[PDB]
Ligand SMILES: *[C@@H]1O[C@H](CO)[C@@H](O)[C@H](O)[C@H]1NC(C)=O
Ligand SMILES: *[C@@H]1O[C@H](CO)[C@@H](O)[C@H](O)[C@H]1NC(C)=O
Ligand SMILES: *[C@@H]1O[C@H](CO)[C@@H](O)[C@H](O)[C@H]1NC(C)=O
């Protein structure tokens with residue numbers, strides 16, 4: 543779950559994943575067209591009353 | 592029609608296939624291709640009935 | 641040939657995975673060439689085979705391609721099958737069909753699993769073709785780098801990174817390494833890989849710049 547957007551991540555042509563410190567998929571490559579996308583969950587946080 | 596191998600010189604690595612068949616020796620007398628004393632062929636048939 | 645010895649001088653670092661990592665320090669356990677290793681130097685003017693100790697680091701620095709076509713056969717004769725990884729400027733053939741070769745095999749210009757021919761388009765095409773060969777779980781991975789040099793005396797005091805190329809399943813008991821000569825002078829270094837732990841520093845562009853061998857000296861153990 544997350545948004546997808548164009549990135550300036552310089553992917554080398556053998557790479558298609560992008561990982562995190564806690565091992566989550568930071569970036570992804572489209573299997574149909576050779577394009578780079580970012581992965582970022584949308585808005586969240588804590589509430590108070 | 593189907594055969595099994597009794598024993599090898601050592602253990603087998605994973606995903607390894609064995610093709611060569613040689614007369615095994617468990618001593619100092621050389622078999623010289625003859626299954627005589629202390630010589631056993633590694634291939635024995637199933638004998639399914 | 642003439643057999644010599646030269647210090648490795650922090651050479652032979654490749655990409656352990658196909659994952660983009662930027663501005664991190666990732667620690668990996670993979671078959672690497674250890675730092676300041678004792679690699680050998682060959683002056684081919686003659687030429688037996690070499691023991692394939694779980695990886696070969698190839699660091700030929702001269703021009704031309706007389707050393708191409710390294711074959712990875714177990715026994716280069718009948719009974720037990722032989723693997724053929726001949727490389728050329730036209731095609732690469734990955735064949736295991738027993739064949740027959742001499743005690744000093746070479747390509748003379750003047751059965752079980754045949755064919756499986758690849759094209760090798762990036763290999764179809766200061767010439768330091770640094771090569772790393774590997775066999776893990778029957779697969780065949782090739783790492784390559786084309787790095788210019790100032791003087792062709794020895795290996796330079798710098799750094800380089802190596803990118804993977806292919807993946808070819810074989811799955812046999814490879815024990816010895818052999819290069820082939822297309823006979824109708826050559827200087828190349830051979831290094832042997834080893835299971836070692838490295839600390840790889842990726843920059844903001846995602847490339848390895850510095851590395852630390854975690855089992856070299858106590859300072860590097862403290863760094864790791
Ligand atoms: C699959 O999609 C890619 C992306 O456009 C295209 O280049 C390729 O030709 C397609 N393959 C087939 C078999 O249609
Ligand atoms: C590499 O090993 C050989 C084996 O005897 C040795 O003679 C040579 O000095 C070594 N190279 C070094 C330590 O740089
Ligand atoms: C397979 O390779 C291993 C390498 O350690 C060797 O010990 C073994 O003898 C080889 N198998 C045969 C049948 O030679």
Ligand SMILES: *[C@@H]1O[C@H](CO)[C@@H](O)[C@H](O)[C@H]1NC(C)=O
Pocket residue numbers: 843844845
């Ligand atoms: C990353 O690539 C850009 C491309 O122009 C370059 O300007 C920059 O210096 C590079 N970053 C490094 C080498 O750390």
